[PDB]
Symmetry: D2
Subunit: 469 residues, 4 copies
């Protein structure tokens, strides 16, 4: 065999220079560009140290103090600490709320949450994907093609935003819920630029007999910082990712109510919530196997970080940065969904200009401007949807303030002005528009300007001064 | 006022979070000061860990390489491409005949994705019964009818069993059951089965009943990569696996699927090609998962390189030799091993002839720094107090232990079980009474000290012991 | 310990084998011709139909299709079933290369469940008219409280469409909107208490927009359809189901019509594409859902389908519609509220809530007066026990020969019944147990029963000779 | 409009001469041949008079006293009498049993019974169709094709008879039930020639947690006459048709337990059965609409007839006739599944002779001998199965006794010998064999002998001229 030191203790740069080289290049990409994917962030080195740790070695199926394996003395303390810090980060009373921190990621957390409270084929309603909801909110297409497993194993009827204002159509939602009678109503979304009227969602849920779940994955950092409405006030269950605005590792959690139910006509006195055992069982043994304890430890670190005054100031800045970027784009005459934002992102409708989102995402990516084409209301094609989604969390984490985001706006303005000029000269068909991308001097200049701008800012997670490139 | 970036973002865990830092340091200590015998556990390499804890965690990359839903994946695509190519290479697969998806978060998501790819809800599956050695996700429901795995809720499961006396898979009963039940999918591979699999026979059975054949090689994938056990790829349509067990990688999953022309079947169009790739990819994303965890994928690409090396082959040989040597020691003491030995990395130990349940042995061992898990054995209904303990060699073999060290582990386990027997005789079989013997017990203290001394004489992969906070 | 002679058990009349059942049937015969039968789904079928219904045809097992049976001995059963199917196509003026029919469903609800089983997998999506809006149980009925009632809401995923709250007409825009979000595999039209005709053309437009199959359940108006007195669903629907005992005036049975031959031009469908319903629908009926056909029903149905094709039957269906209108006009001449303010078919749906009444009260008092109706849900109802309406149909009494002025008398009898219901309620309270107290020893109920009976006995009765009947007064 | 008397009172022979002629030809066919379909019977004129009556005109959804329509004063009394005569015919205590008599037929009864106690995709086990079970007992084929909706809306795992004895393999049933964990186990069958160990079925159901349902459709008449084991002693639910050995109209019935549950380790004290409301709801409003009241009335007549001493003697004779036919066939060296019968039918395995049942059924049909081809153990083809099923109820109703059924045995022996000869001349292929079914002198002679034989017997189901006084 090989001595332990050789295969087991040698650094990555020697054991696997090919992968090491690719990681170093990805590290250089991350701080040499403008990273505007609304679901991305740059997590802390401390989170990354817990992530890449011996915690990966441990099997710990079960719950702390009730495991299927020996050896979990410290894994249990880690998971317990993570759970308690999660309640604290979101200002929850442990007698009123519990949390499962084992979901591998956001989509597993939602599927487990649904499995906990729903039987196969029970009805759900979530925000329609083109209106800003997530895949796992029951997404099938307007052509009736079932995409998400949440529209396969359950019966989805999505609700939509107002086609002209972009705000959730609460009236239609209530009418729909009353006809369809969902077992579960989901709120929260992936590309909705406004806050959520959780009070109205509760009102509606109560009127049709549904459970109410909020998926706060995108805004969970703003929620912890109390910079947006808290779903916990009104929802039975709250799921979330931990890697977005929360700035943690890639993981999920499922919060659930505990204790006495609020008085409701038709329900016994002393009625208590009964989510905890079902939610735990749905994560394990129903759906997952071994928890990823390096994720839980990393999560515990990020949850402590999210409770700090500094994180709260970061969340304020994210919102202020998104507003300042949005105001810049509208000041150039561009069209934002709902005409502004209340959170970390803006949804920018490109159809009034003539372009689809893949065109500007492709050109932007050539300029080290990382966005993602994103569905907008009415869209039927995931290849060429009508908009781009831009978020502030990632570059806010690198220290940027409003003026820097106005310069980001300026770069996007240039990128889109180039996009239209390439379209007005080489056509609207895709491959014909690709022609204007090869050896484009204005792209190279925009790229050079973007790299120059990006390199002026700090980078969490790792030392620029030690990276290979 | 926002924190300066370095203050929250560039400072070490030791400073940002002393509590978690200390707990990770205690766990690192616990990992090298005991004997780790959980068959599904391993100690992965520092190189794997360096990729796992990396900026790769920052990137959203839904889709496939070259077909993503986000910009910025120039290097993610190369890493995932590399990871998939090394996966095929590790298992000696022709890329015209096999593809792989390396995005599943873990083994259970890999299986549920593979099922979702090829099955509609409520379709029929057949896997090894859990008390016979099969995994949760192979359709586990209890002998009392209680649906446990979601793979028994969203699909219709009919488990097959081992022979009640011999402990080997009853292939005749499996075929008879399969022909009556008519499953869409037959699953092989196990979690607590100590023998190799007659995959050729599984193929014949699957052909007779029209079923797909999937092997879950999570436990033995390391031995398969080293060609130390039967390869499921010769006969199975689909192979799922985890990567953190005998394969010694990160925690992740992998789905392998055939590609290219299908073999001849009467009633098949000629020039018929497999059609798994698109379905399997689609099942993983956008059907079930969201963003890949690229730090896992990167770490996996590193582990797959390490598993394709001569030293890993010799590791896999040693793992098997250690399990055998340990099984022989235990059996020499009169202990019952299911199937009377092993052909892989684990032994399944039936404690019932001793008048013991595995939770008692597990608890006592844990106090002695011997880390095992209680395990169901044939006929068990209690997951709380099943009739067995399961012992594996991958983890301690990765620390450099050879047969004589595993005979020593056999003796420690012998002492552990003898002690458990003594506690029970003094205080009683009830768990509340038995626990009364676990407190201030000098022989537990003594066995623990002996285990810690033995365990401390071996190297540890993954981190430098000279660097750890708790060296004593 | 000996076997009875065959004739003793097997050839003796009901009147001697079973005096108690014979007497009860004689009392039901008396009941049927001595009151006013206004249940919209009831009719009085012919003696000829009844003679086929009670026949040796009941003795035969004939699973399968004519010429492809699982039993021998079907030489004549095959000819009867073929004649029934061909007469079914002819009664609805269907080209046999464009339409086929299955005449084995035991009744209307089996017919629908089979039609759905043929074209749907379990949990597939369906949209039918909401029951309080006029749709049938088997059209996906679950309550506004979310309780699944019909198995069609258990084995399939239902989303009902509704009428406009104020007008009572189907809200076609809301249906289209709902269909586009819900994406049903099947849209159902036809109803049980919808008093207007159906815009089948619009249903086809909606169904094509969402890629759904389109099925019409014409159970209630099938007689009016055969007579070409209402819109024909066959122009626009893929599948048409129906009972045969309602306005069609036959036995209790069901039928499933389905298209055959080339499919009309649709972008995305291959050229030379043909319908593929026949095998699927037959298989759903048998072996999937039913066992042996009820050949006495099929024979009787064959008789009814011949009778439905006659000039006299078309005149019947015109008189049914004229009678319903005359009755509706009389009722709203008194200020009563009919849903949609009138009718285009055989029934009216009478919303009693503006009177402060529920249908179960009116139904109970009517029954005591020999006026046979049924309480019936109206828009917004949640209670099947005490719904807000009563439904009145013309088919049964029209079959006894009643014309418009007779139906205006019926309206007056109904007006008197509702007035008495109001007085009993005013005097005895609105709670059911208190209202019931006013139904005992009530002279006006006695008087109205007497007037109804004397009116009722002035008309003929199909199905049996009143001159042979045991209870002639 | 036609006067009422023209369209509505004129007899069938004038309104519709075509259908009248076909019915008359069918009556002639029924009394001129030998009717051996085990599921067929000749019902009484009294039953038929109730079936063809003004009861067909009434809508009566709901239960007696709780209808969705007015006017049910007398339909309620008819249905109540039907239900109580159903309990009486099967010697059931009304405190311990209820019955729903609205199922349109046997298959509707079973699907409703299952819908009452099962959720979609719940697990059931019934006797495999080639082993003798019914379509509605979860039938999918050995090639895995779902055939019955009971294998589509529910999850079926059939249990089989012993391959070599033809008797149900109870040990394998138990083993299967323990592995599969069905919610419902069904017993009773369509082509099983032996009685059922209901005691063992109860033991197996108690052991795996399942409800136990008997579909007694084929033997219900023998059950009412207490000539076979009663399923009611051990089963939670008993479904049945009424038109087979029970000699009634085509209808279904669902019996269900009521009252205190028998002592069971785990069940709370004072536990009561809770089937009634669920069974009623499953029939209506879940699955059916309006009851067919003319069937309910005709059923009430048949149930009174089934309670009689003469019907008990009929049931004895059915069983004696099946035994005598079975012994005659075996005496010719033919193979019967299980080597005999304990009920009304014999299942005849034609494979040892190189024959499939469709050939025998076709030939027999040409000779006015009405049988049905029938699957036997191992069969995959429904078109050309391995056997023929022969039943005694119908001929017995015409007064035939053991010697008459031995002559039937001889006609069957002649028919099969004649089939084994048309297959030497013409070949095993259907289209080939089929050529010998035209201008066959032996077929013609056999048909004439069968005719002469059948014409010597009485026939129920028309009115006797002397009784034209009442
Ligand atoms: N053969 C085999 N052994 C194995 C596993 C496996 O999948 N297969 N496991 C990992 O792969 C662990 C055991 N996984 C299990 C998880 C839940 C239950 C179970 O029956 N849970 C019920 C009862 C709980 C109780 O009794 O306290 C429940 O959760 O309610 C059994 C085994 C370790 N050993
Ligand atoms: N054991 C048993 N015998 C019985 C019946 C039964 O239900 N069970 N039957 C009454 O209860 C009749 C047979 N009923 C059957 C109906 C359909 C199929 C069947 O498998 N049909 C397929 C194959 C068609 C073909 O091969 O041509 C199909 O319809 O697609 C089999 C038997 C008479 N004998
Ligand atoms: C055969 C098999 N398949 C899949 C899994 C699941 O892997 P994850 O825990 O990553 O989901 C396991 C885990 N079994 C763990 C054990 O046997 O102890 C397994 O044994
Ligand atoms: C609202 C929401 N919920 C759950 C998830 C799932 O997280 P995972 O990818 O870890 O499964 C996402 C991810 N959406 C990513 C994006 O909006 O770009 C999300 O936006
Ligand atoms: C056991 C059994 N159960 C139910 C039925 C169905 O009855 P209906 O055909 O009325 O739906 C049958 C009919 N089997 C007919 C035969 O054996 O020939 C049956 O044999
Ligand atoms: C539209 C419609 N479809 C099907 C049926 C069912 O017929 P059966 O009862 O034979 O199952 C009805 C009966 N409804 C009766 C009524 O409206 O009063 C109906 O109105």
């Amino acid at each position: 065999m090989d001595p332990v030191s050789v295969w087991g203790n040698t650094p990555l740069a020697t054991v696997d220079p090919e992968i090491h080289d690719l990681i170093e290049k990805e590290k250089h990409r991350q701080c040499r560009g403008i990273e505007l994917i609304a679901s991305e962030n740059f997590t802390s080195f401390a989170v990354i140290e817990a992530l890449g740790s011996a915690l990966t070695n441990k099997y710990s199926e079960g719950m702390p103090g009730n495991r299927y394996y020996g050896g979990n003395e410290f894994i249990d303390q880690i998971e317990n600490l993570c759970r308690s810090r999660a309640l604290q980060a979101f200002h929850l009373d442990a007698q009123s709320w519990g949390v499962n921190v084992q979901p591998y990621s956001g989509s597993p957390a939602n599927f487990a949450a649904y499995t906990a409270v729903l039987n196969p084929h029970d009805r759900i309603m979530g925000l329609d994907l083109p209106s800003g909801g997530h895949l796992t909110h029951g997404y099938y297409t307007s052509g009736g093609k079932k995409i998400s497993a949440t529209s396969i194993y359950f019966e989805s009827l999505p609700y939509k935003v107002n086609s002209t204002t972009g705000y959730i159509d609460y009236d239609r939602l209530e009418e729909k819920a009353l006809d369809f009678r969902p077992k579960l109503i989901i709120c929260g979304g992936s590309a909705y630029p406004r806050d959520w009227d959780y009070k109205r969602f509760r009102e509606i849920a109560d009127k049709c007999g549904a459970l109410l779940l909020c998926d706060m994955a995108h805004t969970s950092g703003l929620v912890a910082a109390q910079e947006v409405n808290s779903p916990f006030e009104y929802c039975d269950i709250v799921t979330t990712t931990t890697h977005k605005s929360l700035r943690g590792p890639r993981a999920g959690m499922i919060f659930y109510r505990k204790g006495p139910k609020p008085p409701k006509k038709g329900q016994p006195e002393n009625a208590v919530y009964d989510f905890e055992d079902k939610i735990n069982f749905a994560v394990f043994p129903s759906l997952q196997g071994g928890p990823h304890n390096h994720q839980i430890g990393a999560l515990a670190v990020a949850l402590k970080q999210a409770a700090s005054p500094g994180f709260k100031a970061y969340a304020k800045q994210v919102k202020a940065n998104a507003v300042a970027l949005g105001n810049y784009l509208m000041g150039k005459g561009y069209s934002l969904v709902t005409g502004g934002t209340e959170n970390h992102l803006v949804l920018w409708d490109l159809r009034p200009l003539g372009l689809t989102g893949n065109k500007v995402e492709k050109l932007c990516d050539l300029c080290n401007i990382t966005v993602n084409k994103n569905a907008v209301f009415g869209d039927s094609s995931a290849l060429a949807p009508g908009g781009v989604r831009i978020g502030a969390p990632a570059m806010t984490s690198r220290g940027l303030v409003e003026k820097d985001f106005e310069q980001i706006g300026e770069f996007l303005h240039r990128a889109v002005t180039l996009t239209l000029e390439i379209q007005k000269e080489h056509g609207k068909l895709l491959k014909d528009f690709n022609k204007g991308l090869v050896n484009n001097k204005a792209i190279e200049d925009l790229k050079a300007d973007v790299e120059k701008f990006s390199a002026t800012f700090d980078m969490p997670g790792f030392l620029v001064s030690e990276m290979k490139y």
